[PDB]
Scaffold this active site. Structure first.
Site, PDB file in Angstrom:
ATOM      1  N   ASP A 121       0.953  -1.209  -0.062  1.00 25.76           N
ATOM      2  CA  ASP A 121       0.076   0.030  -0.146  1.00 25.76           C
ATOM      3  C   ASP A 121       0.953   1.242   0.010  1.00 25.76           C
ATOM      4  N   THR A 159      -7.014   3.227  -1.817  1.00 22.52           N
ATOM      5  CA  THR A 159      -6.723   1.792  -1.876  1.00 22.52           C
ATOM      6  C   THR A 159      -7.373   0.768  -2.334  1.00 22.52           C
ATOM      7  N   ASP A 261       2.202   2.951   3.067  1.00 22.27           N
ATOM      8  CA  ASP A 261       1.137   4.070   3.098  1.00 22.27           C
ATOM      9  C   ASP A 261       0.910   4.498   4.516  1.00 22.27           C
ATOM     10  N   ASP A 683     -21.297   9.552 -26.700  1.00 17.72           N
ATOM     11  CA  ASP A 683     -21.436   8.637 -25.362  1.00 17.72           C
ATOM     12  C   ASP A 683     -22.407   9.329 -24.486  1.00 17.72           C
ATOM     13  N   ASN A 685     -24.750   8.275 -23.019  1.00 21.71           N
ATOM     14  CA  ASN A 685     -25.222   7.631 -21.624  1.00 21.71           C
ATOM     15  C   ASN A 685     -23.676   7.267 -20.835  1.00 21.71           C
ATOM     16  N   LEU A 689     -18.821   3.627 -24.003  1.00 20.35           N
ATOM     17  CA  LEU A 689     -19.084   2.826 -25.391  1.00 20.35           C
ATOM     18  C   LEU A 689     -19.759   3.434 -26.356  1.00 20.35           C
ATOM     19  N   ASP A 691     -22.470   5.033 -28.500  1.00 19.21           N
ATOM     20  CA  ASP A 691     -24.004   5.100 -28.583  1.00 19.21           C
ATOM     21  C   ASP A 691     -24.629   4.393 -29.994  1.00 19.21           C
TER      22      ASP A 691
HETATM   23  C1  LIG Z   1     -15.268  -2.795 -18.573  1.00 23.48           C
HETATM   24  O1  LIG Z   1     -15.466  -4.098 -18.699  1.00 23.48           O
HETATM   25  C2  LIG Z   1     -16.658  -4.602 -18.692  1.00 23.48           C
HETATM   26  C3  LIG Z   1     -16.964  -6.096 -18.320  1.00 23.48           C
HETATM   27  O2  LIG Z   1     -16.675  -6.673 -19.463  1.00 23.48           O
HETATM   28  C4  LIG Z   1     -17.859  -3.993 -19.206  1.00 23.48           C
HETATM   29  O3  LIG Z   1     -18.847  -4.106 -18.148  1.00 23.48           O
HETATM   30  C5  LIG Z   1     -19.854  -4.838 -18.741  1.00 23.48           C
HETATM   31  O4  LIG Z   1     -20.747  -3.981 -19.912  1.00 23.48           O
HETATM   32  C6  LIG Z   1     -21.736  -4.469 -20.510  1.00 23.48           C
HETATM   33  C7  LIG Z   1     -22.685  -3.451 -21.059  1.00 23.48           C
HETATM   34  O5  LIG Z   1     -22.699  -1.968 -20.614  1.00 23.48           O
HETATM   35  C8  LIG Z   1     -22.816  -5.227 -19.531  1.00 23.48           C
HETATM   36  O6  LIG Z   1     -23.681  -6.118 -20.190  1.00 23.48           O
HETATM   37  C9  LIG Z   1     -25.067  -5.849 -19.740  1.00 23.48           C
HETATM   38  O7  LIG Z   1     -25.158  -6.800 -18.556  1.00 23.48           O
HETATM   39  C10 LIG Z   1     -26.517  -6.950 -17.936  1.00 23.48           C
HETATM   40  C11 LIG Z   1     -26.386  -8.240 -17.050  1.00 23.48           C
HETATM   41  O8  LIG Z   1     -25.653  -7.741 -15.887  1.00 23.48           O
HETATM   42  C12 LIG Z   1     -25.631  -8.316 -14.768  1.00 23.48           C
HETATM   43  O9  LIG Z   1     -24.871  -9.857 -14.914  1.00 23.48           O
HETATM   44  C13 LIG Z   1     -23.291  -9.602 -15.024  1.00 23.48           C
HETATM   45  C14 LIG Z   1     -22.828 -10.966 -15.105  1.00 23.48           C
HETATM   46  O10 LIG Z   1     -22.683 -11.623 -14.233  1.00 23.48           O
HETATM   47  C15 LIG Z   1     -22.669  -8.627 -13.971  1.00 23.48           C
HETATM   48  O11 LIG Z   1     -21.504  -8.662 -14.015  1.00 23.48           O
HETATM   49  C16 LIG Z   1     -23.521  -7.374 -13.893  1.00 23.48           C
HETATM   50  O12 LIG Z   1     -22.707  -6.697 -12.962  1.00 23.48           O
HETATM   51  C17 LIG Z   1     -23.150  -5.220 -12.710  1.00 23.48           C
HETATM   52  O13 LIG Z   1     -24.305  -5.135 -11.764  1.00 23.48           O
HETATM   53  C18 LIG Z   1     -23.884  -5.633 -10.517  1.00 23.48           C
HETATM   54  C19 LIG Z   1     -25.255  -5.214  -9.945  1.00 23.48           C
HETATM   55  O14 LIG Z   1     -25.814  -3.904  -9.849  1.00 23.48           O
HETATM   56  C20 LIG Z   1     -22.624  -4.904  -9.787  1.00 23.48           C
HETATM   57  O15 LIG Z   1     -22.309  -5.500  -8.616  1.00 23.48           O
HETATM   58  C21 LIG Z   1     -21.638  -4.909 -10.757  1.00 23.48           C
HETATM   59  O16 LIG Z   1     -20.517  -4.123 -10.277  1.00 23.48           O
HETATM   60  C22 LIG Z   1     -21.849  -4.401 -12.340  1.00 23.48           C
HETATM   61  O17 LIG Z   1     -21.970  -3.077 -12.243  1.00 23.48           O
HETATM   62  C23 LIG Z   1     -21.553  -2.241 -13.520  1.00 23.48           C
HETATM   63  O18 LIG Z   1     -22.461  -2.736 -14.427  1.00 23.48           O
HETATM   64  C24 LIG Z   1     -23.665  -2.413 -14.650  1.00 23.48           C
HETATM   65  C25 LIG Z   1     -24.624  -2.880 -15.975  1.00 23.48           C
HETATM   66  O19 LIG Z   1     -24.588  -4.351 -15.846  1.00 23.48           O
HETATM   67  C26 LIG Z   1     -23.863  -0.760 -14.578  1.00 23.48           C
HETATM   68  O20 LIG Z   1     -25.369  -0.550 -14.336  1.00 23.48           O
HETATM   69  C27 LIG Z   1     -23.145  -0.373 -13.163  1.00 23.48           C
HETATM   70  O21 LIG Z   1     -23.245   1.058 -13.496  1.00 23.48           O
HETATM   71  C28 LIG Z   1     -21.833  -0.887 -13.137  1.00 23.48           C
HETATM   72  O22 LIG Z   1     -20.883  -0.172 -13.984  1.00 23.48           O
HETATM   73  C29 LIG Z   1     -25.161  -7.519 -13.418  1.00 23.48           C
HETATM   74  O23 LIG Z   1     -25.216  -8.129 -12.293  1.00 23.48           O
HETATM   75  C30 LIG Z   1     -27.564  -7.176 -19.024  1.00 23.48           C
HETATM   76  O24 LIG Z   1     -28.831  -7.314 -18.331  1.00 23.48           O
HETATM   77  C31 LIG Z   1     -27.727  -6.065 -20.025  1.00 23.48           C
HETATM   78  O25 LIG Z   1     -28.464  -6.320 -21.167  1.00 23.48           O
HETATM   79  C32 LIG Z   1     -29.854  -5.017 -21.067  1.00 23.48           C
HETATM   80  O26 LIG Z   1     -29.132  -4.211 -22.204  1.00 23.48           O
HETATM   81  C33 LIG Z   1     -28.466  -4.316 -23.396  1.00 23.48           C
HETATM   82  C34 LIG Z   1     -28.216  -3.200 -24.146  1.00 23.48           C
HETATM   83  O27 LIG Z   1     -27.168  -3.496 -25.052  1.00 23.48           O
HETATM   84  C35 LIG Z   1     -29.623  -5.049 -24.123  1.00 23.48           C
HETATM   85  O28 LIG Z   1     -29.200  -5.659 -25.346  1.00 23.48           O
HETATM   86  C36 LIG Z   1     -30.508  -6.115 -23.364  1.00 23.48           C
HETATM   87  O29 LIG Z   1     -31.762  -6.443 -24.389  1.00 23.48           O
HETATM   88  C37 LIG Z   1     -30.838  -5.663 -22.000  1.00 23.48           C
HETATM   89  O30 LIG Z   1     -31.802  -4.700 -22.021  1.00 23.48           O
HETATM   90  C38 LIG Z   1     -32.876  -4.699 -20.951  1.00 23.48           C
HETATM   91  O31 LIG Z   1     -32.523  -4.342 -19.906  1.00 23.48           O
HETATM   92  C39 LIG Z   1     -32.215  -2.877 -20.170  1.00 23.48           C
HETATM   93  C40 LIG Z   1     -31.163  -2.041 -19.061  1.00 23.48           C
HETATM   94  O32 LIG Z   1     -32.138  -2.479 -17.734  1.00 23.48           O
HETATM   95  C41 LIG Z   1     -33.435  -2.014 -20.464  1.00 23.48           C
HETATM   96  O33 LIG Z   1     -33.431  -0.615 -20.605  1.00 23.48           O
HETATM   97  C42 LIG Z   1     -33.994  -2.795 -21.597  1.00 23.48           C
HETATM   98  O34 LIG Z   1     -35.296  -1.851 -22.343  1.00 23.48           O
HETATM   99  C43 LIG Z   1     -34.290  -4.199 -21.682  1.00 23.48           C
HETATM  100  O35 LIG Z   1     -35.237  -4.542 -20.845  1.00 23.48           O
HETATM  101  C44 LIG Z   1     -26.200  -5.934 -20.567  1.00 23.48           C
HETATM  102  O36 LIG Z   1     -25.824  -7.032 -21.525  1.00 23.48           O
HETATM  103  C45 LIG Z   1     -22.022  -6.035 -18.166  1.00 23.48           C
HETATM  104  O37 LIG Z   1     -23.023  -6.316 -17.309  1.00 23.48           O
HETATM  105  C46 LIG Z   1     -20.986  -5.267 -17.804  1.00 23.48           C
HETATM  106  N1  LIG Z   1     -20.303  -6.006 -16.799  1.00 23.48           N
HETATM  107  C47 LIG Z   1     -19.711  -5.381 -15.582  1.00 23.48           C
HETATM  108  C48 LIG Z   1     -18.967  -6.482 -14.814  1.00 23.48           C
HETATM  109  O38 LIG Z   1     -19.488  -4.207 -15.335  1.00 23.48           O
HETATM  110  C49 LIG Z   1     -17.508  -2.600 -19.625  1.00 23.48           C
HETATM  111  O39 LIG Z   1     -18.325  -2.001 -20.435  1.00 23.48           O
HETATM  112  C50 LIG Z   1     -16.005  -2.122 -19.833  1.00 23.48           C
HETATM  113  N2  LIG Z   1     -15.722  -0.588 -19.841  1.00 23.48           N
HETATM  114  C51 LIG Z   1     -15.248  -0.112 -20.860  1.00 23.48           C
HETATM  115  C52 LIG Z   1     -15.157   1.526 -21.242  1.00 23.48           C
HETATM  116  O40 LIG Z   1     -14.987  -0.875 -21.971  1.00 23.48           O
HETATM  117 CA   LIG Z   2     -22.485   5.071 -24.690  1.00 19.91          CA
HETATM  118 ZN   LIG Z   3      -3.498   5.686   2.255  1.00 18.37          ZN
END
Ligand SMILES: *[C@@H]1O[C@H](CO)[C@@H](O[C@@H]2O[C@H](CO)[C@@H](O[C@@H]3O[C@H](CO[C@H]4O[C@H](CO)[C@@H](O)[C@H](O[C@H]5O[C@H](CO)[C@@H](O)[C@H](O)[C@@H]5O[C@H]5O[C@H](CO)[C@@H](O)[C@H](O)[C@@H]5O)[C@@H]4O)[C@@H](O)[C@H](O[C@H]4O[C@H](CO)[C@@H](O)[C@H](O)[C@@H]4O[C@H]4O[C@H](CO)[C@@H](O)[C@H](O)[C@@H]4O)[C@@H]3O)[C@H](O)[C@H]2NC(C)=O)[C@H](O)[C@H]1NC(C)=O
Ligand SMILES: [Ca+2]
Ligand SMILES: [Zn+2]
Ligand SMILES: CCCc1c(OC[C@@H](O)COc2ccc3c(=O)cc(C(=O)O)oc3c2CCC)ccc(C(C)=O)c1O
Ligand SMILES: [Cl-]
Ligand SMILES: [K+]
EC number: 3.1.4.39
Length: 805
Positions: A121, A159, A261, A683, A685, A689, A691
């Site tokens: 750390d 951290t 740290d 972007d 939202n 990624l 839009d």
């Molecule tokens: C960095 O790398 C990461 C990892 O690869 C990239 O993140 C991924 O991005 C994908 C797109 O944004 C995303 O895919 C979505 O997943 C949904 C299922 O999600 C759950 O299950 C997974 C798998 O285990 C899990 O990891 C998720 O984890 C998130 O949420 C939990 C609980 O909240 C947290 O503990 C965790 O930290 C994580 O949060 C982060 O991600 C979420 C989004 O999932 C954000 O909201 C947070 O702010 C935070 O950043 C979940 O538990 C799946 O349901 C989605 O599908 C919907 O949307 C698509 C649009 O393309 C559509 O095709 C589908 O039809 C569906 O739509 C329906 O739902 C909509 C939304 O409610 C609704 O509006 C519509 O009308 C429909 O009803 C989608 O596939 C993936 O989950 C995340 N994963 C992680 C780990 O973050 C990231 O993009 C990279 N960054 C860059 C810059 O490259």
């Molecule tokens: Ca976007």
């Molecule tokens: Zn510190």
């Protein structure tokens, strides 16, 4: 309630934690106040200290001792780490010569080299040089193994967000640990360093390495250690686990030190009190390596020495107070310190207004030491917006400063001299990476890289498939002797159209005009050839970018530039052109100031129109290929094609015009030509990624012309600047940016001055990796080079930071 009446007898530091209210004996039980009654007695023995002495050699085993020097200790797996040195005449690992580890040299029963991650750390990158006299074990790991001059942490440079990024390969906005303190409004729950809420699994998203391993049948040591377990015991526990039977023994282990740290906060990063903490961490590394040597694992294990973030000088007199800016200071909650996050104190307060808070915090004091941002406006390289736990208002605090709500917060919470959390490009926040082992290269220096890349490599070291993450898998293959990951380039999803001349000028009713009715068989053939691609090799140096989603677009060729023009978004996705060192800058001729020209290759229905811009009183336009850099008066007309125009606020055109008129030529002079690819980004939202068309929140008034949130450029040249950009035989050099497309220049406090005093500073703040642009555009660049794909993946992750060395 915990039934602590149970016992840790033969359970000390057991790997699986048991179910409440049964008492626990794992390395986290202390943190939960749930250890069995006899956990201290049995599991935290301290008798006789941590070191064998001559008189203990061949002692009768006394099970009370912290560690053992009896003949049987090597088979029990519990000797003091210096046992063989003291008692069997062996040398300390640090005193042995470096010898290349060409293949793993492992005891029978080892299925793969174990991975041991030694995390520290607050270990600032410059300690590797500055403290090198007092860290001989860490210096040997560094010189003998593979090391980078520094490793870039994630923002905020706190951290837990950084250690959890090491575990997951994710940005904090994705893994959910977005600071050392957080409010999640969906949960209505708060996460804090102290206390119990932070152990709830709903904070910790993604899939950390210990879960990745376990799901794929590779066993893992626990990565968390209760703070009160001394480091010597953490090391002895890891060494004990390494003596477990093959079917029980983990393959991955993590040690953690709270130093340096802890002392850096008290004494500052270079306080004279810091030498001792560094010597003490070195001694801990020495214990580990001697212990591995005893176990004959010192040429078997891969060791990672890695830090979470560095440490800056920060004293209480360098604190900005929001009470000096806001009338309404009691109506907000601030998360304070080396960053600021603001939200409303009460969700029932209808007078709360983020716009008035931002304005009151914007450029109010001459040397103001923080800058406010709506989170969507923060530099895209921070990747810090896409989580409900991140407050809409953010303060980026200058290095060496704090921000607080009120003066009383600083003395009723000043002996502290060090802190961290600032922008992760700041030099003082950089931290360390060394890899040592059969799988890492021997005596090899690699360039700085981002800590988000390590998960994939740790997965490669363990033969695991990584969960989806933000690293670029293959970008760190140059750290490895073996186990490299050999990715294929993504397949192109949409192939381009190549339109020829298909429309007469009169079919266009776009409200555009140009004074271009101004004219030969030598010249006529050549103009046709240019429009067919005859100069394309000069301007498209690394192949056409591939479009990785389903869309309709056209390739347009020109004398001076090539573009991939989206029929859907009505503008280029990308515009590529090369500027040689010798190129000349010219003006836009007076007769051409307002010239926009229909493109007879692209239908009216798929073009922008000038009348929408006249009607939109806020919105103007710029061009992607700059008319200033035309190769000739005649070629300049191509720059005013409606297919090269994009929407720009006037305040942004000040930035863009200065970049195009002055900076591109300056970079070509400095770098011996540059190739530029520029384009829009949408972007709305703020998820990092590209839009889709239905996510676009703003259009040029009255039209279907979408307004970009940002504009990017990727500027590539030859790493060996003795070769011109267009004739480069070897590695490339790149810098890129993602500039926010904003209607004011309120971010730049000096913007009323000439662009030469503020624009480049703005661009530097918004420096980007090519990979960041790829995420934002669904484009894949550098598809046709002479370079290995892994080298190109490394180039794509490069970030030009502008800090001194
Ligand atoms: C960095 O790398 C990461 C990892 O690869 C990239 O993140 C991924 O991005 C994908 C797109 O944004 C995303 O895919 C979505 O997943 C949904 C299922 O999600 C759950 O299950 C997974 C798998 O285990 C899990 O990891 C998720 O984890 C998130 O949420 C939990 C609980 O909240 C947290 O503990 C965790 O930290 C994580 O949060 C982060 O991600 C979420 C989004 O999932 C954000 O909201 C947070 O702010 C935070 O950043 C979940 O538990 C799946 O349901 C989605 O599908 C919907 O949307 C698509 C649009 O393309 C559509 O095709 C589908 O039809 C569906 O739509 C329906 O739902 C909509 C939304 O409610 C609704 O509006 C519509 O009308 C429909 O009803 C989608 O596939 C993936 O989950 C995340 N994963 C992680 C780990 O973050 C990231 O993009 C990279 N960054 C860059 C810059 O490259
Ligand atoms: Ca976007
Ligand atoms: Zn510190
Ligand atoms: C954080 C994720 C897991 C992880 C690592 O955690 C190591 C873990 O011991 C760090 O825990 C810490 C660190 C500081 C403090 C405090 O200052 C105060 C308090 C308190 O007052 O309670 O508790 C702390 C704890 C919790 C002790 C359970 C290390 C390295 C990695 C890597 C390399 O991935 C990794 O994932
Ligand atoms: Cl924080
Ligand atoms: K306008």
């Amino acid at each position: 309630w915990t039934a602590t009446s149970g016992s840790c007898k033969g359970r000390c530091f057991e790997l699986q934690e048991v179910g409440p209210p049964d008492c626990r004996c794992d390395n986290l039980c202390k943190s939960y106040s749930s250890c069995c009654h006899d956990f201290d007695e049995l599991c935290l023995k301290t008798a006789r200290g941590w070191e064998c002495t001559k008189d203990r050699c061949g002692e009768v085993r006394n099970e009370e001792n912290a560690c053992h020097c009896s003949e049987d200790c090597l088979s029990r797996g519990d000797c003091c780490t210096n046992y063989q040195v003291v008692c069997k005449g062996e040398s300390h690992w640090v005193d042995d010569d470096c010898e290349e580890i060409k293949v793993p040299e492992c005891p029978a029963g080892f299925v793969r080299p174990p991975l041991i991650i030694f995390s520290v750390d607050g270990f600032r990158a410059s300690y590797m040089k500055k403290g090198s006299k007092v860290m001989p074990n860490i210096e040997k790991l560094r010189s003998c193994g593979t090391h980078a001059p520094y490793m870039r942490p994630v923002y905020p440079t706190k951290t837990f967000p950084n250690l959890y990024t090491l575990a997951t390969g994710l940005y904090p906005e994705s893994h959910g640990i977005v600071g050392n303190s957080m409010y999640d409004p969906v949960f209505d729950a708060s996460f804090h360093l102290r206390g119990r809420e932070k152990f709830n699994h709903r904070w910790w998203g993604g899939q950390p390495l210990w879960i990745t391993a376990t799901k794929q049948g590779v066993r893992a040591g626990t990565f968390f250690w209760s703070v009160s377990i001394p480091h010597e015991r953490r090391i002895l526990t890891i060494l004990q686990w390494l003596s477990l039977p093959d079917n029980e023994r983990p393959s991955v282990y993590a040690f953690y030190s709270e130093q340096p740290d802890f002392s850096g906060h008290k004494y500052g990063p270079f306080g004279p009190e810091m030498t001792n903490p560094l010597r003490e961490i070195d001694k801990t590394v020495g214990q580990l390596m001697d212990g591995l040597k005893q176990l004959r694992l010192h040429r078997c294990v891969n060791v990672i020495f890695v830090g979470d973030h560095g440490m800056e000088d920060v004293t209480c007199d360098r604190t900005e107070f929001l009470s000096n800016y806001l009338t309404n200071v009691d109506d907000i909650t601030l998360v304070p310190g080396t960053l600021g996050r603001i939200r409303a104190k009460s969700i029932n307060n209808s007078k709360y207004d983020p716009k008035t808070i931002i304005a009151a915090l914007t450029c109010k004091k001459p040397d103001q030491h923080f800058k406010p941002y709506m989170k969507q406006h923060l530099p895209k390289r921070l990747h810090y917006a896409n989580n409900r736990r991140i407050e809409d208002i953010h303060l980026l605090v200058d290095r060496r400063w704090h921000v607080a709500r009120k003066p009383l917060d600083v003395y009723k919470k000043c002996f502290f001299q060090g802190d961290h959390g600032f922008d992760n490009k700041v030099n003082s926040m950089q931290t360390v990476f060394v890899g040592y082992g059969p799988t890492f290269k021997y005596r090899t220096k690699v360039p700085p890289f981002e800590n988000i890349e390590l998960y994939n490599v740790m997965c490669d070291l363990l033969g695991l498939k990584p969960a989806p993450n933000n690293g670029t898998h293959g970008s760190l293959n140059h750290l490895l002797r073996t186990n490299t990951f050999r990715p294929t380039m993504p397949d192109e999803v949409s192939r381009p159209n190549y339109p020829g001349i298909m429309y007469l000028q009169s079919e266009f009713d776009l409200g555009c005009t140009c004074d271009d009715k101004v004219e030969n068989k030598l010249e006529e053939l050549n103009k046709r050839l240019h429009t067919k691609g005859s100069t394309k090799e000069r301007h498209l140096l690394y192949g056409r970018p591939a479009v990785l989603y389903r869309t309709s677009y056209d390739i347009l060729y020109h004398t001076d530039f090539e573009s991939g023009y989206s029929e859907i978004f009505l503008m280029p996705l990308w515009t590529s052109y090369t500027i040689s060192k010798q190129a000349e800058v010219s003006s836009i001729p007076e007769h051409l100031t307002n010239c926009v020209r229909p493109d007879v290759r692209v239908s009216p229905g798929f073009s922008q129109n000038c009348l929408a811009y006249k009607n939109d009183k806020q919105m103007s336009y710029g061009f992607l290929f700059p008319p200033y850099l035309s190769s000739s008066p005649e070629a300049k007309y191509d720059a005013f094609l409606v297919t090269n125009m994009v929407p720009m606020y006037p305040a942004f055109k000040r930035v863009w015009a200065y970049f195009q008129r002055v900076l591109v030529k300056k970079y070509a002079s400095e770098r011996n030509g540059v190739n530029v690819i520029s384009g829009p980004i949408f972007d709305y939202n703020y998820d990092g990624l590209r839009d889709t068309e239905d996510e676009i929140k703003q259009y040029v008034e009255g039209s279907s012309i979408p307004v970009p949130t940002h504009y990017y450029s990727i500027i590539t040249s030859c790493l060996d600047f003795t070769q011109p950009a267009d004739k480069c035989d070897g590695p490339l050099s790149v810098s890129s940016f993602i500039l926010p497309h904003r209607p004011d220049n309120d971010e730049s406090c000096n913007s009323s001055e000439d662009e030469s005093k503020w624009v480049e500073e703005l661009m530097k703040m918004h420096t980007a990796r090519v990979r960041d642009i790829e995420h934002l555009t669904g484009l894949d660049f550098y598809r046709k080079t002479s370079r290995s794909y892994s080298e190109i993946l490394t180039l794509k992750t490069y970030l030009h930071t502008y800090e001194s060395e």
